Amino acid sequence: SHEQFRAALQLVVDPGDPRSYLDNFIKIGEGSTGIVCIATVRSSGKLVAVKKMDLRKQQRRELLFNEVVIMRDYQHENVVEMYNSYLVGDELWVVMEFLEGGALTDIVTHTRMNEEQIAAVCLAVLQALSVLHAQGVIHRDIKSDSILLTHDGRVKLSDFGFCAQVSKEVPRRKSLVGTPYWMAPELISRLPYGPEVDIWSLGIMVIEMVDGEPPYFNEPPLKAMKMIRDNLPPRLKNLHKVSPSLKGFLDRLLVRDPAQRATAAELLKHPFLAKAGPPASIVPLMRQNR
Ligand SMILES: O=S(=O)(c1cccc2cnccc12)N1CCCNCC1
Incomplete structure (x- = not known):
């Protein structure tokens, strides 16, 4: 074989x-x-x-x-x-x-991003997802580990090893794929799903950027999945550490009902992304500069 x-x-x-x-x-x-x-x-x-x-x-x-x-x-x-x-x-x-700037993981685990910087990342990622979803490509492993940076702060999506395509002939995927803590509820529930799962996963990455870890990261993988499946959308550790603009944005990402979740196209128009800084704003966060 x-x-x-x-x-x-x-x-x-x-x-x-x-x-x-x-x-x-x-x-x-x-x-x-x-x-x-x-x-x-x-x-x-x-x-x-x-x-x-x-x-x-x-x-x-x-x-x-x-x-x-x-x-x-x-x-x-x-x-x-x-x-x-x-x-x-x-x-x-x-x-x-x-991508010599490394992965977003190294930044979220060692420094605290402000919202100019979080918005820059979200805008870059949503731009990529909007184009991919429009062609039926679902990434399925969005997380800080999959976001890479250039030395001058440009943000790029990587690690497409788990992706899939949907289309008129194949409107939904059914496979259990991704990284437990970032997986959307409907995927864990084994429901047929679409590009919406990348949007949930991005929400979890926003939590990474604010808190440093995804929800339930201390729990074992199989237990965390059960908790994602059963419980209400996960919460920030400290809500006072986010602007109402960012809270309102996050609220469009972490919606359990896939039909009610925002699409990448719609999110590109969200007011929070108006705070997005240039790539330069990300540069001081990288190991070689902090
Ligand atoms: O930074 S990587 O070395 C990496 C991956 C893919 C392309 C890369 C290109 N340039 C630097 C690092 C890259 N990486 C390891 C695999 C999973 N953990 C995080 C991502």
Whole structure:
């Protein structure tokens, strides 16, 4: 079965081996589907990222094709640029843009963002989601770990390994996918769902940005899911630490009934996002500057 899948991947990826033009691989990250290294382009001295995913180490091996469909069809300003894909031994390698500012996780766990900064992030993410949802693409793993930054504060969506497409022929998805603490209620309830689940997950990320952790983060994953499924929408630790504008925004995200939840398109017009600062406003939050 493994050799069968190797062959299948070979027919969709680029030919060759990026080790022929890259030097000095250094591991910088570990994700749900594999590791991420920086590498130096020999000819230019430029830095790229290389995501390496072991075919044998996947829960759902077929989801590896998501990397390919996204790379081919859904490139965008607030989405990480993907350059080439390769089959290297038993691994799928994706050579992509290096986002040197790192992931939003490092910021939310170590510093407190103000609302100019939170609004900047939300605006960037919602811009990406509005375009993706309009083409039927659902990300399904929105969380601070999936948001990457450039050195000058530009925000980009990454980690599309769990995404799916809906359409007239396939209006809803049914799969149990994502990261427990960020999963929408209807998804946990095993109801057919749509792009609305990304909006709930963004709400949880707003809580990350304000409080530093998602709700129920101290609980075990399976217990947290049960609590998300059963209880009223999760609450901020301290409501006084958010403006009424941000509270009103968050209230449109964390709605249990998917039909009543705001869409990305509608949220781009919300007053809270008027507070959004330029990318420069994010820069002082990064490790190399604080
Ligand atoms: O920052 S990453 O190293 C990362 C991922 C994908 C592309 C990247 C591009 N440049 C820097 C870091 C990147 N990352 C590890 C996996 C899951 N945890 C957080 C994300």
